[PDB]
């Protein structure tokens, strides 16, 4: 009679239904809440506008695509319940919104790439509103690229007779020769180019961040900040970010050595920082002019690279080059045995806390020592940038693969097994595609929050 039925069990449909609903509460709440939370306030503004556009897109995917497809595409497969305009309209909207979320994710990866990798070059100067026009153009491209779906999709009577009312389905009506063209184009524009961009860009971000020395945010913990002259651990005269000056007693030459203006014992914030910049600069410069400390510095990464600078900052190139064998092991990646060496009477266990903190950094190559404060900014930057690529590709890859085989697996391996597998596959793929628009609110608040670097 109408043997175009699909035999996917009630239990898998309940499962998928559940999942879709969870995805729905999460996606809708997150997108809505973000777009109305950033309906209130450069250059992070630009990334805010990008986020706004993103959340809007995802929200519209959830509102327009989900309910109808949940009914007609996963529960009652035939006939098509919403008429021709229903059919073409649905598919056009689907297409438009997906182009939108893809182009947006890309554009955001591009903007972030610019901000982080070319801060002065790109970010501060070139990047500025109106990038509203960019988002506008994105939406326009979404619409125009979705235009084909209005001609390709349609209503067709596929019942055995081709006359019975219960066989009226929504399906590509044009010649199958063109269907391939259309969906291949869609595959490239909505997945391939974007996914390549996301991939390489975010990878470059991640590597740039992993290679950046968190040295400053590290010292601000250990060394603190006092903009009125004081006494340090061993009772010498210090100001600013632990900048020792005129260590000789007493309070007078200390105040004289306050250069550069008559400090009168007190300094301003921007002065304590500019002082701190010079100190950190003279440390690295001390590292790179010293024959014992340079090649060790060179071989290290970025964390244990900061760890050294800390020590050089605290004790000068002269003292740190006095740790001969520890250096020999650090250069040899003996993190284990070199940590034990430093922990020995190193005499620099006159301040054990600061020493313990530096050795468990050297040892682990991670920031576990420095509390849960945003010295973890870089690492989180990395992880978030990985999350982006993983999330996008995982969520959208199988979706596009399923669409390709609709028109390519075509002829003639279309068995019962394949016809079935196709629809279970469909469940899966739309589940992931809808997982995109619910994972990316929560994820992208984390990258929005992750701009303490700039």
């Amino acid at each position: 009679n109408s043997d175009l039925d699909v035999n996917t069990d009630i239990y898998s449909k309940v499962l998928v239904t559940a999942i879709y609903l969870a995805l729905f509460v999460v996606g809708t709440v997150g997108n809505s809440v973000t777009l109305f939370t950033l309906a209130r306030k450069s250059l992070q503004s630009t990334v805010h506008y990008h986020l706004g556009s993103l959340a809007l897109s995802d929200l519209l995917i959830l509102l327009l695509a989900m309910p109808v497809e949940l009914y007609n595409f996963i529960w009652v497969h035939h006939p098509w319940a919403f008429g021709d305009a229903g059919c073409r309209g649905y598919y056009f909207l689907r297409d438009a919104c997906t182009y939108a979320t893809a182009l947006n994710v890309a554009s955001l990866s591009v903007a972030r790439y610019l901000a982080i990798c070319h801060p002065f070059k790109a970010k501060t100067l070139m990047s500025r509103s109106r990038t509203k026009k960019f988002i506008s153009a994105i939406w326009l491209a979404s619409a125009l690229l979705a235009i084909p779906m209005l001609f390709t999709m349609g209503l067709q009577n596929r019942s055995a007779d081709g006359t019975h009312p219960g066989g009226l389905v929504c399906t590509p009506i044009v010649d199958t020769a063109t269907v391939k063209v259309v969906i291949q184009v869609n595959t490239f524009m909505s997945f391939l180019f974007p996914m390549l961009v996301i991939s390489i860009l975010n990878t470059v971000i991640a590597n740039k961040l992993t290679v950046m020395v968190n040295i400053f945010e590290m010292l601000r913990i250990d060394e603190g900040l006092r903009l009125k002259i004081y006494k340090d651990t061993e009772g010498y005269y210090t100001i600013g970010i632990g900048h020792l000056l005129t260590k000789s007693p007493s309070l007078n030459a200390a105040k004289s050595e306050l250069d550069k203006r008559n400090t009168n014992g007190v300094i301003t914030k921007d002065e304590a920082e500019k002082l701190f910049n010079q100190d950190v600069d003279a440390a690295v410069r001390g590292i790179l002019r010293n024959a014992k400390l340079k090649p060790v510095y060179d071989s290290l990464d970025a964390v244990r690279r900061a760890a050294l600078i800390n020590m050089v900052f605290q004790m000068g190139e002269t003292g740190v080059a006095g740790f001969t064998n520890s250096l020999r092991m650090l250069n040899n990646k003996r993190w284990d045995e070199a940590a034990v060496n430093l922990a020995k009477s190193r005499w620099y266990n006159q301040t054990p806390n600061r020493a313990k903190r530096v050795i468990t950094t050297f040892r682990t190559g991670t920031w576990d020592a420095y509390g849960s404060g945003s010295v973890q900014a870089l690492r989180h930057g990395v992880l978030v940038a990985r999350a982006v690529v993983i999330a996008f590709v995982v969520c959208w890859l199988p979706y596009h693969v399923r669409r390709l085989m609709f028109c390519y697996i075509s002829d003639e391996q279309w068995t019962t097994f394949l016809f079935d597998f196709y629809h279970y596959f469909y469940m899966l793929t739309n589940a992931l595609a809808y997982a995109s628009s619910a994972i990316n609110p929560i994820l992208y608040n984390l990258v929005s929050a992750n701009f303490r670097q700039v």
């Binding site: 595409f73 389905v169 590509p172 669409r403 016809f419 196709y422 469909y426």
Partner: peptide
């Protein structure tokens, strides 16, 4: 005989 749903 193939799927009708894209």
């Amino acid at each position: 005989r193939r799927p009708y749903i894209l």
